[PDB]
């Protein structure tokens, strides 16, 4: 990812596509009332338009924990396949 | 020559032509597939102590 990202609360996903998790956002001009519902649990917070923009500030940068290496595990997954 | 009126095929040659092959046990299919499916359990279960799921699809952390 780059240093500056320009997405969040504009042209966003408004609703979920599955039934396994129920998403409901309510966008005003400034903030948004998101309502998430997964399983028995529920949560609903207020995400500002400048709260999603600070999300991509410090990146996650996922990386694979392999037994030997990612190369070897992809060959061994093919031999298992 | 009374022995030439006896059946010339021995009692030995009957017991080796009637019992020619050692027969397959009923339990040797169980205890040979079970020991081979215990390796299918080990490698491929998700509750085994030696699963291959972290060796073939390394986890994204």
TrEMBL record, chain A:
Q: Under what name is this protein listed?
A: Mitochondrial ATP synthase associated protein ASA7
From TrEMBL, chain B:
Specify the protein name.
Mitochondrial F1F0 ATP synthase associated 14 kDa protein
The organism encoding this protein is Polytomella sp. Pringsheim 198.80
């Amino acid at each position: 990812l780059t240093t500056f990202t320009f997405s969040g609360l504009q042209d966003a996903p408004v609703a979920a596509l599955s039934g396994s998790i129920k998403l409901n956002v309510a966008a005003k001009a400034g903030k948004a009332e998101v309502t998430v519902a997964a399983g028995a649990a529920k949560a609903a917070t207020q995400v500002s338009a400048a709260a999603l923009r600070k999300l991509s500030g410090s990146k996650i940068s996922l990386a694979e924990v392999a037994r030997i290496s990612v190369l070897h595990s992809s060959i061994q997954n093919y031999l298992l396949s | 020559d009374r022995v030439l009126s006896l059946p010339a095929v021995s009692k030995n040659q009957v017991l080796e032509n009637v019992f020619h092959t050692a027969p397959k046990a009923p339990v040797e299919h169980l205890e040979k597939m079970v020991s081979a499916n215990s390796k299918v359990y080990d490698a491929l279960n998700l509750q085994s102590k030696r699963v291959l799921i972290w060796q073939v699809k390394p986890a994204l952390f």
